[PDB]
Amino acid sequence: TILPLNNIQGDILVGMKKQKERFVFFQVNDATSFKTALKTYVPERITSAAILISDPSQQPLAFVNLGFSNTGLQALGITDDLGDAQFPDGQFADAANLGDDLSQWVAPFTGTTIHGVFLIGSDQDDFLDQFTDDISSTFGSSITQVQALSGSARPGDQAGHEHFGFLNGISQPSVTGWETTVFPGQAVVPPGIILTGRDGDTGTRPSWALDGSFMAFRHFQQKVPEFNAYTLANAIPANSAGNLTQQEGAEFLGARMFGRWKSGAPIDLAPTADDPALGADPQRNNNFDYSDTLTDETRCPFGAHVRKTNPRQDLGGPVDTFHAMRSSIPYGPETSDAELASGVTAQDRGLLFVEYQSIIGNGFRFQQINWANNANFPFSKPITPGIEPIIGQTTPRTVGGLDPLNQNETFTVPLFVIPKGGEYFFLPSISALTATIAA
Numbered sequence: 001t002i003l004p005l006n007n008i009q010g011d012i013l014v015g016m017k018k019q020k021e022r023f024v025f026f027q028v029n030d031a032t033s034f035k036t037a038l039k040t041y042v043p044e045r046i047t048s049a050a051i052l053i054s055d056p057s058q059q060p061l062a063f064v065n066l067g068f069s070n071t072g073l074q075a076l077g078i079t080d081d082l083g084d085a086q087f088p089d090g091q092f093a094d095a096a097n098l099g100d101d102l103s104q105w106v107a108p109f110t111g112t113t114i115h116g117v118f119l120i121g122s123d124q125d126d127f128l129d130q131f132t133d134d135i136s137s138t139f140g141s142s143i144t145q146v147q148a149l150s151g152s153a154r155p156g157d158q159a160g161h162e163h164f165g166f167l168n169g170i171s172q173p174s175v176t177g178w179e180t181t182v183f184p185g186q187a188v189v190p191p192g193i194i195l196t197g198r199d200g201d202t203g204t205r206p207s208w209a210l211d212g213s214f215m216a217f218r219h220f221q222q223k224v225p226e227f228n229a230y231t232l233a234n235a236i237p238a239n240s241a242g243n244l245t246q247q248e249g250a251e252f253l254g255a256r257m258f259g260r261w262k263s264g265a266p267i268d269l270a271p272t273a274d275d276p277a278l279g280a281d282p283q284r285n286n287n288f289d290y291s292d293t294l295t296d297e298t299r300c301p302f303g304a305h306v307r308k309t310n311p312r313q314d315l316g317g318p319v320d321t322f323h324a325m326r327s328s329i330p331y332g333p334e335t336s337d338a339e340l341a342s343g344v345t346a347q348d349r350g351l352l353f354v355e356y357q358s359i360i361g362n363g364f365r366f367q368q369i370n371w372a373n374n375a376n377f378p379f380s381k382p383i384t385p386g387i388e389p390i391i392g393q394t395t396p397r398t399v400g401g402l403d404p405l406n407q408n409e410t411f412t413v414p415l416f417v418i419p420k421g422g423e424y425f426f427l428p429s430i431s432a433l434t435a436t437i438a439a
C-alpha cells in the first residue's frame, strides 16, 4: 500500500511539532453556512502529512487540522456509524470509566456541546493568532467558539520537555505504507492501527472514513511543586551503584516513576544514573524492550509510565494492536522558585494531550484502563506492579518496586495530573472534509 500523504491530516501521522499550538473548540450554529465556508477553507489551510514532511521552505507559517465530535457530525447531517464503541457517547460519558474525578471537569467539556476542534500549530504567537483570526473571519457566525486552549513548548533547554521536567515525544510507532526513518527499538505497525479503513484496522468503517483517525484529547492540569516535593520526601536512599544524596535520590525516584530520566535516557538502558547524551540520541534512546527485566525491578519498575503505556516484551513479543501516535503540548508558565519552595501549585500549567488511533478502545483507552489503572498489569510478575504513578487513576494509588533495592516496598502516590476535560474526535481525510462533510 502507498498512503496518500497529501490526503491525510498531518498531525495524525507526522505531528505538527510546533512550539505553539491552539485548540479551538466550537459548536456549529448553521450547518449550511459552515459547509460553504469549509469548502473554501480546507484547500487553503488544512495541512497534510505531505506538507509536514516537506522542507520548511515549502511550509505555511502555521498548520491547521480539524476534527469533529459525534454531536458535530450529527449537527452536520453526517449520520453513518463510524464503528467506534466510545466515539458516539463522547468522553464525558466515558470519564468515570477512565477513573476521572468528575468534580474536576469543567465547561464546556461537561456534556457534548462541543462539535469539533481546529488545531493550529505554529512556531510563533503572531502566526498562531493570525491563523486563529482567519478561522473566526472565514466561518463567522456559522460557528461559536466555546473554548480555546493554547499551549507552548517550554523555554531554552527545556524545549520538548513537559512541566515535570521530562523530555517527551521520543517513542512513537512507525506505520508501513510510506517512506520513513525507523529508529532502533521503534515499533513498526500496519497503517490501520492509526488510520481508519487501512490494513490493521478491524473496525467497521464507512468508505468515506478512509484515512481518518480518532483523537483522544485530554486537558491535564499538572501539580509540579507537589510532584517535586513528593520525590524529595521519598528520595531513594541508594541504588546498585551506591548511596545517593537526597537530590540524586529524588531525581532517581522521578525517573523510576516515568521509566526515563528527564534527559530522555530510558532507565532500562541507564538504570542507576542519567546518561544525557543517550537521552538526546534517537539512535539509542528507544533501543530497549524490557527483555532484560521481565521478572525483576532493578532495571525498571513494572509500573513505570512508559512501561505501562507501551509494555514491549512484557506482552511476550511485538503486538501491533495497542500502539498510538501522540502530539501533546505543554501549557502554562514555568514553575517559579517560590512555588517549588512552597511545594504548592499557584499557577495553572499542564499538558494538552493528544493521542491518535483507529480504535479508541485499543489505544488511549486500553493504555489507560487495561494497563495504567490495572494494579495487576503487566501480568505474571513476581511483585504486584500497582497503579501507574503519573496517570493511573485507581485509588489507592499504590505502586510497587520504585526502590530497586527494596522492591517489595510500596509507594502511595498523590495524584499530580488532574483531568479537567477532554473529548473524542474524528479527523477525516482531507478529501472527506470537502466531498463528504461539506457536501
Ligand code: HEM
Binding pocket: 162, 163, 164, 166, 167, 168, 169, 170, 171, 172, 218, 220, 222, 258, 260, 305, 306, 307, 309, 310, 324, 350, 351, 353, 355, 364, 365, 367, 368, 372, 390, 391, 417
Ligand atoms: C500530563 C500527563 C502526561 C505526562 C506528563 C506524560 C509524559 C510522558 C513522558 C515524559 C514520556 C516519555 C517520552 C516518550 O517516550 O515519548 C511519555 C511516554 C508515553 N506516554 Fe505519556 N504522559 C502523560 C499522559 C499520558 C497518557 C494519559 C497516556 C495514555 C493513556 C500516555 C501514553 C504514553 C505513551 C504511549 C508513551 C510512549 C511509550 C513508549 O512507546 O515507550 N501518556 N509520556
Ligand SMILES: *[C@@H]1O[C@H](CO)[C@@H](O)[C@H](O)[C@H]1NC(C)=O
Binding pocket: 237, 243
Ligand atoms: C551508605 O549509606 C549508609 C546509610 O544508609 C551509610 O551507613 C554508609 O556509610 C554509606 N556508604 C558510604 C561509605 O558512602
